[model samples]
Target: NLTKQKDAVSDTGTAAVVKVVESQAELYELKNTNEKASLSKLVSSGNISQKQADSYKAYYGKHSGETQTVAN
Candidate 1:
């Protein structure tokens, strides 16, 4: 039966990682696409830095093409 929690741990871990990566990617896209304000504005309004924002952008760019596969 397929109800035996087959590969559940691996699948869950992969899903979590994918979710984080995709979320970061979307945030990066938002930062680039939104022209109403600059990242410095957000940074100045709070405790984050322009460097921190740039780090997220760089991470998404670096891992945007990673491949994941499920094996049965």
Candidate 2:
């Protein structure tokens, strides 16, 4: 769950946090091998900001909202 969230915004080669996310921490823990420490590791590694971790941890995850305009 957290790893998915981490992998999503992680902006790494795999690109999963935005895609990771299991909803249940333990559930995800059981699933991912990429997440040795995951968010805990990413934040410490200086890949992601502490604020990003805080935001994701407090909620489901992050979503970049963009509006598209079309001409009919």
Candidate 3:
């Protein structure tokens, strides 16, 4: 049998999008518990791009109160 440790990056685009959506869910959860959660800081901290932080804000607005846990 063969072993592969670097398989996580094998799928480039489709899987990347799915994971990004899931990560956004966690940030939404952060905003729920911590009112100080800020997308601007995320961008300033270099954790995510300006576009990603903006998209996450837009996404949360569209799907707020949907769930507390990050969905699949």
Candidate 4:
């Protein structure tokens, strides 16, 4: 029925939304800053992983619990 057509669109829309949001996270969230707290939000929110967080920290020369890390 038409109900099935509507439901199918919603399902596909959700999948597309995930990819779009994930891409934005990579472009904006990760690249926005080098602060551990900021990146920690991504991990805590389940957007990224701790391993990737550590790698990002190193790449940005940010050490945990440092004033520079919080200086933002």
Candidate 5:
């Protein structure tokens, strides 16, 4: 898997790949730039909600979605 690329390259390459992998490692099917530019636009346009925007985020060292909270 990820290990295959590591053996051929130097140690630095191995490290570099991890970071690249880490970033790609989290793609939630929804996701940033200007950084908040798109977020701001989406929220303002009322085409999206705060919850929806937040869910678009990805955690590099992390994990989830597919769950919901009730608004009481």
Candidate 6:
């Protein structure tokens, strides 16, 4: 089993594969942009409460290293 595993690929090939894998890594920077805009619209339309809207803002802000305070 060890010999079979070693035969799979040498160090050079493994490094190349790792580089290829990293190159395709998903960047989720844009995923929340549209969702935030849609949520803002929902809050403006009164479809959701201000508390809910603020919670979304706080969640996104925390990930983005921003501060947010929601009204109780």
Which is the leading candidate under TM-score? 3
lDDT: the better of candidates 3 and 6? 3
User: What lDDT, from 0 to 1, does candidate 5 have?
Assistant: 0.33
Q: Identify the runs in model 3 with alpha carbons over 4 angstroms from their true place.
A: 1-36, 64-72
Error of 6 at 5 (Å): 58
lDDT tens digits by residue: candidate 2, 1-72? 535534334344222333232222334345544553344544554555555444444443332322101000
Off by over 4 Å in 6: 1-36, 65-72
Task: Show where candidate 1 strays beyond 4 Å.
Answer: 1-12, 34-72
For each candidate, give its TM-score against the true structure: 0.30, 0.32, 0.39, 0.35, 0.27, 0.35
Off by over 4 Å in 4: 1-37, 62-72
**Model 2 Cα shift for residue 42 (angstroms):** 0.6
> Against the true structure, whose lDDT is highest?
3
Clashing pairs in 5: none
For each candidate in turn, give its C-alpha RMSD to the true structure in angstroms.
11.7, 16.2, 9.6, 13.0, 12.8, 15.3
Across 18-62, the per-residue lDDT of candidate 5 in tens digits comes to: 333233322211243213233334544444454443443332213
* lDDT per residue as tens, model 6, 5-56: 3435534343332232222211111333333333344456454545555555
Please give the clash total of every predicted structure, in order: 0, 11, 0, 0, 0, 0
Instruction: Report the poorest 10 consecutive residues by lDDT, candidate 5.
Output: 63-72
Q: Answer with 2 or 6, whichever has the higher TM-score.
A: 6
Residue pairs clashing in model 4 are none
The C-alpha stretches of model 5 lying farther than 4 A from their native spots are 1-37, 59-72
* Higher-ranked by TM-score: 1 or 4: 4
Model 5: per-residue Cα lDDT at residue 29: 15
The CA lDDT of each predicted structure is 0.40, 0.36, 0.49, 0.44, 0.33, 0.37
Q: Model 3: how far is 32 from its true place, Å?
A: 15
In order of lDDT, best first, we have 3, 4, 1, 6, 2, 5
lDDT of 6: 0.37
